[PDB]
Amino acid sequence: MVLQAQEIMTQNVVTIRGSATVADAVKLMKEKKLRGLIVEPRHEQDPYGIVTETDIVYKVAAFGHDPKTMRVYEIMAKPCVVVNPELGVEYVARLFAQTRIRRAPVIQGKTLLGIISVSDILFKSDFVEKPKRLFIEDEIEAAREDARAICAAKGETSPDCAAAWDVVEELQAEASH
Amino acid sequence: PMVLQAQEIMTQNVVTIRGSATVADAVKLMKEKKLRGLIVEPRHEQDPYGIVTETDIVYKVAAFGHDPKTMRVYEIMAKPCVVVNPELGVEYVARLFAQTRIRRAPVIQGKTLLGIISVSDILFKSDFVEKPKRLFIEDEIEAAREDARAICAAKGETSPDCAAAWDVVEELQAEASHQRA
Amino acid sequence: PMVLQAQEIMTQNVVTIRGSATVADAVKLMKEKKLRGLIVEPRHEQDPYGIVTETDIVYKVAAFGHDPKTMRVYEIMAKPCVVVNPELGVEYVARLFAQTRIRRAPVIQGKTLLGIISVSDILFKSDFVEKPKRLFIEDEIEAAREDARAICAAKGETSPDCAAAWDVVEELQAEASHQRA
Amino acid sequence: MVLQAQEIMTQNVVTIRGSATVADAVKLMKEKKLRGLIVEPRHEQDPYGIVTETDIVYKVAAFGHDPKTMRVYEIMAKPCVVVNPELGVEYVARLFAQTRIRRAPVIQGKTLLGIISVSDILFKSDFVEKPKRLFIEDEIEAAREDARAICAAKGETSPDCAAAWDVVEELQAEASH
Amino acid sequence: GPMVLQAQEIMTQNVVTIRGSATVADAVKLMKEKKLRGLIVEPRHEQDPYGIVTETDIVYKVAAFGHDPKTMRVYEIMAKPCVVVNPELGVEYVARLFAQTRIRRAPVIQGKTLLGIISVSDILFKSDFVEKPKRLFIEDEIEAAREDARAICAAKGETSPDCAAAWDVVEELQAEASH
Amino acid sequence: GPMVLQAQEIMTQNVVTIRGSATVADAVKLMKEKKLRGLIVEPRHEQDPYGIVTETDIVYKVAAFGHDPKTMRVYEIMAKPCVVVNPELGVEYVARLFAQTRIRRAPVIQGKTLLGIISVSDILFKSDFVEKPKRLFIEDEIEAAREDARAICAAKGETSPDCAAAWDVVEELQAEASH
Ligand SMILES: C[C@@H](O)CN1CCN(CC(=O)O)CCN(CC(=O)O)CCN(CC(=O)O)CC1
Ligand SMILES: C[C@@H](O)CN1CCN(CC(=O)O)CCN(CC(=O)O)CCN(CC(=O)O)CC1
Ligand SMILES: C[C@@H](O)CN1CCN(CC(=O)O)CCN(CC(=O)O)CCN(CC(=O)O)CC1
Ligand SMILES: C[C@@H](O)CN1CCN(CC(=O)O)CCN(CC(=O)O)CCN(CC(=O)O)CC1
Ligand SMILES: [Yb+3]
Ligand SMILES: [Yb+3]
Ligand SMILES: [Yb+3]
Ligand SMILES: [Yb+3]
Ligand SMILES: [Yb+3]
Ligand SMILES: [Yb+3]
Ligand SMILES: [Yb+3]
Ligand SMILES: [Yb+3]
Ligand SMILES: [Yb+3]
Ligand SMILES: [Yb+3]
Ligand SMILES: [Yb+3]
Ligand SMILES: [Yb+3]
Ligand SMILES: [Yb+3]
Ligand SMILES: [Yb+3]
Ligand SMILES: [Yb+3]
Numbered sequence A, D: 001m002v003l004q005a006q007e008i009m010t011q012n013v014v015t016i017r018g019s020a021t022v023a024d025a026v027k028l029m030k031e032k033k034l035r036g037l038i039v040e041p042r043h044e045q046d047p048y049g050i051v052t053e054t055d056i057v058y059k060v061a062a063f064g065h066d067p068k069t070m071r072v073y074e075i076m077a078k079p080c081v082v083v084n085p086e087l088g089v090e091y092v093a094r095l096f097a098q099t100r101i102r103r104a105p106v107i108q109g110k111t112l113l114g115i116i117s118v119s120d121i122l123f124k125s126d127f128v129e130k131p132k133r134l135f136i137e138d139e140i141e142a143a144r145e146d147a148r149a150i151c152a153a154k155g156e157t158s159p160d161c162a163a164a165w166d167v168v169e170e171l172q173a174e175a176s177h
Numbered sequence B, C: 001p002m003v004l005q006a007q008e009i010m011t012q013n014v015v016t017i018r019g020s021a022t023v024a025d026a027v028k029l030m031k032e033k034k035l036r037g038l039i040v041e042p043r044h045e046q047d048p049y050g051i052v053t054e055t056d057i058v059y060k061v062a063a064f065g066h067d068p069k070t071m072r073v074y075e076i077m078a079k080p081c082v083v084v085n086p087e088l089g090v091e092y093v094a095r096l097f098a099q100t101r102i103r104r105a106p107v108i109q110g111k112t113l114l115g116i117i118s119v120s121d122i123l124f125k126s127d128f129v130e131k132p133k134r135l136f137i138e139d140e141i142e143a144a145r146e147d148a149r150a151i152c153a154a155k156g157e158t159s160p161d162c163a164a165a166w167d168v169v170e171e172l173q174a175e176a177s178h179q180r181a
Numbered sequence E, F: 001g002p003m004v005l006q007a008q009e010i011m012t013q014n015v016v017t018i019r020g021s022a023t024v025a026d027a028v029k030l031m032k033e034k035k036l037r038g039l040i041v042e043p044r045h046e047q048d049p050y051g052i053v054t055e056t057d058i059v060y061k062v063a064a065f066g067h068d069p070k071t072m073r074v075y076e077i078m079a080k081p082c083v084v085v086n087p088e089l090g091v092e093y094v095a096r097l098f099a100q101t102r103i104r105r106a107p108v109i110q111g112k113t114l115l116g117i118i119s120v121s122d123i124l125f126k127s128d129f130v131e132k133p134k135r136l137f138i139e140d141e142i143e144a145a146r147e148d149a150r151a152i153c154a155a156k157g158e159t160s161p162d163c164a165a166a167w168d169v170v171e172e173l174q175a176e177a178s179h
């Protein structure tokens, strides 16, 4: 089976109010050893947010702002990009690359189950031993249509026909790990 | 209930396409149905939603002169794509969009596709002209009260600085009701 | 004449607004006329065209919760804005748009505003599905002929490498006509 | 009067074919001492393009590509952003900041008149001695409407009325250099 | 201490290197065994610059496309040259260098010797910025406010309200720069 | 010469500095008199990093908004720390450092001494990349192709077609890296 986000996520996830200071955030991250805090929703409809080590370094430290006067609402992402627990890790990897984030809460319904990061992916993903190309199932469909057309046009016993079907088979082998 | 939600302003006519379709098939569907975005069908329970938009097609195919009859949707779609909760307030959708630099997203609840929401939807149907509320003002109010409580403890409960800090709490609270009205 | 031009696919209904108007006035006009972009009127002969678009309004006003009744168009417009020649081929418009990361621009000839052209206009009305031509293929052909001429001079006019280099010139020239048809 | 692009542009502008090699481009730039070449339109409808020192350094030198095999069409901007000769330099400065370019051809109709750059602006603009805020005329209109409203509401002889008109006057003074 | 905290005082000292010719699988294996979010790429000779490959390079460039780490090589995804950090550089400057260049980690180099590796985590966990916040370029602000003050006093007189005001700006700033 | 051309061989040697506390007008005046597209910002002390302010900083951040250069200061628009260049660094690496960090000019620093200033123009006008083009990290490619070659020969025999093929890859690459 495809390895899922919830199988590699960090389960220790702490939350903080958006009204807290950045100093409060930094203290919590130091005590708990955390590179990201989830911002508590204030009510059922209110979205999840996140504040991360990079937010704090780029937006506070890099200008020399006083973390005791800045607040989490001034530097958090809210709404933040979120991850389904069933989502395959290769998709998380990609969501992360496309949106340029390194971590996200894992949410199922409106319940917070954990937090998943690039480090989680590097350290616990099966991607070295089971690399599987994204959208391969869509590739398989397309390569079958191509193969069917080449064989109709050039003949069932032509080198180009046999080549096109070989593509269908290398892909199907690749999709079954 | 009070804040206008994504589902109240989304476009409900949402069409999907397979990732294996050609870009030409995508363009034909968008022209027939008059659509600036197609949702890519999930292949199974776990598989995420994706999107292909007018800009994907123009920037990745038209601008190079690629043949839409040989490219496929999987070559230019975003998958996973950023998604929007139906309960999310429109001011938050506006912000999600600004932070992620997108102009449209599917509205998804659980794994069910309810619609599609865009910057146009926001411009044409949001209540932001008549009910403007600054984002996180409620968090500002909490912080200004903590600041005020600290300044009064430090400088004395009858000090000009104490009364000033509470006046900031009150200008903010006036601002938060003026618009909750 | 052969290549489909910007003016043949542009939207002709183009409305303008003053830079001094409020964002609320802009939003009202866009809603009445159903428009995703307003052109900002030049104040005099030399003054450039500007644009304010649905995204400017959503990203700069809605996403922060600013009051559109107190902000002004000059605070969120692009001026000068990128402009499009009416004679420009649509594949070039597609590319200008990709390189500059915009989705719409006024079509201007001299200082006269003829219309407005967008990615939607391109998606819905461009001939790129049926007449795909790779950009700068004609420049590729010239370069491949220079390469071919050099390889033949260096390795001999009857050499496999000479005949191969000219075969590249011919596959390209076949590709450039297949679509000029 | 507002200083215009054509008054500060470089008039020595050389062109090159898009089919030329990057080595040809580099040779021409070295002989003529130029940080940008205009790409010749091939016919009346064909847009102007540009290739600049940065294109060459970022796209060829930084990867170690052979300038003798790469071509100008592979690294040029075409269409390129263009400048009207009548456009005020403060607007050129801004067009440049918004589009993140440092140079553009000056075109009137379809005739190439010159080339204008950030250096041209730094060295020949009047911006140190006559800095003029962009869209001030639009600001003036808005400040008059504000002033008219405050005086109607609070009275013609109120401090807030006199303050609002003082804004109208500081702006009008600023717009006349 | 009262001095500005320096990069070398907060850097991670356990720094491992890899050749640019190694596979990404070799890189991933090393990072897993040693528990590391970044490897320094060995310079091949005196002139050759340092490089870096990081957890994000690997996830964004290899995992997210489904490339085979056993066939890709570190030279295909590393930054070389990479941005490098002086050991004497103040952490608030490292924070800024990081923001301006959009990186999250860099080698600490003195001459051509590798001393360690410094990251945003190092900054979050070990910087003194909570207890000693100092605005960037306040020292430059102080110099400018002194030049302004000197000029106003020369022009308007050394005992003038405007002179005393301008020096009061110099003093509020100097108080802000210390503690 | 045959060696890789270094930053110090193509840098501009006329390099002027300015304090961060100076006005942008002072900066503009200096750049006009000396004919310069960039000024180096003086470090205030041993630990303090180098900075830079460039023609683009001034045009994009001051001119384009209509700010008064007589009231703005260099610290409000400079990069500090700025990316810096070793004098021994090869120009193809400078070109790359520039692309990766999105800058067009940098100081050349050896230790804490300022030797000059190097820019994209310097690279365009004085680089040997037309006559000596070398692909970046080809040396790393060569190392990898030798490891591959060594393995194929150990596995399949030293006289096997596959062995001779793998070494032929090593030789085409080595020819490409020279002349
Ligand atoms: C309300 C103010 O008093 C602010 N308060 C800080 C606010 N936060 C979170 C929050 O209460 O929203 C920390 C919660 N904590 C215990 C608790 O209150 O539940 C702190 C106790 N005190 C005083 C008090 O609360 O009685 C410190 C000041
Ligand atoms: C610390 C701040 O609270 C200062 N406080 C002013 C000083 N005092 C009493 C005191 O608080 O020592 C006045 C009494 N009064 C109600 C009350 O305090 O019970 C004030 C109401 N507010 C808000 C609030 O009280 O929460 C104003 C701020
Ligand atoms: C056509 C080929 O011959 C290529 N040609 C290079 C092309 N360019 C520009 C161009 O001609 O499009 C340089 C022009 N120049 C004089 C001229 O031709 O007008 C070169 C002369 N020769 C031979 C020749 O042209 O007769 C060199 C090879
Ligand atoms: C240098 C290349 O031009 C080689 N050339 C092949 C060698 N020879 C003659 C020769 O060119 O020495 C064949 C004669 N023939 C027409 C002619 O050359 O006049 C070829 C047509 N083409 C294109 C072209 O000729 O422009 C093929 C390329
Ligand atoms: Yb079969
Ligand atoms: Yb179906
Ligand atoms: Yb329409
Ligand atoms: Yb690709
Ligand atoms: Yb109180
Ligand atoms: Yb206010
Ligand atoms: Yb009018
Ligand atoms: Yb519509
Ligand atoms: Yb502003
Ligand atoms: Yb010939
Ligand atoms: Yb082909
Ligand atoms: Yb009057
Ligand atoms: Yb860990
Ligand atoms: Yb030595
Ligand atoms: Yb050591």
Ligand SMILES: [Yb+3]
Binding pocket: none
């Ligand atoms: Yb650690």
Ligand SMILES: [Yb+3]
Binding pocket: none
């Ligand atoms: Yb002064």
Ligand SMILES: [Yb+3]
Binding pocket: none
């Ligand atoms: Yb004194």
Ligand SMILES: [Yb+3]
Binding pocket: none
């Ligand atoms: Yb010059």
Ligand SMILES: [Yb+3]
Binding pocket: none
């Ligand atoms: Yb020393």
Ligand SMILES: [Yb+3]
Binding pocket: none
């Ligand atoms: Yb000197």
Ligand SMILES: [Yb+3]
Binding pocket: none
């Ligand atoms: Yb020069």
Ligand SMILES: [Yb+3]
Binding pocket: none
């Ligand atoms: Yb192998």
Ligand SMILES: [Yb+3]
Binding pocket: none
């Ligand atoms: Yb041998």
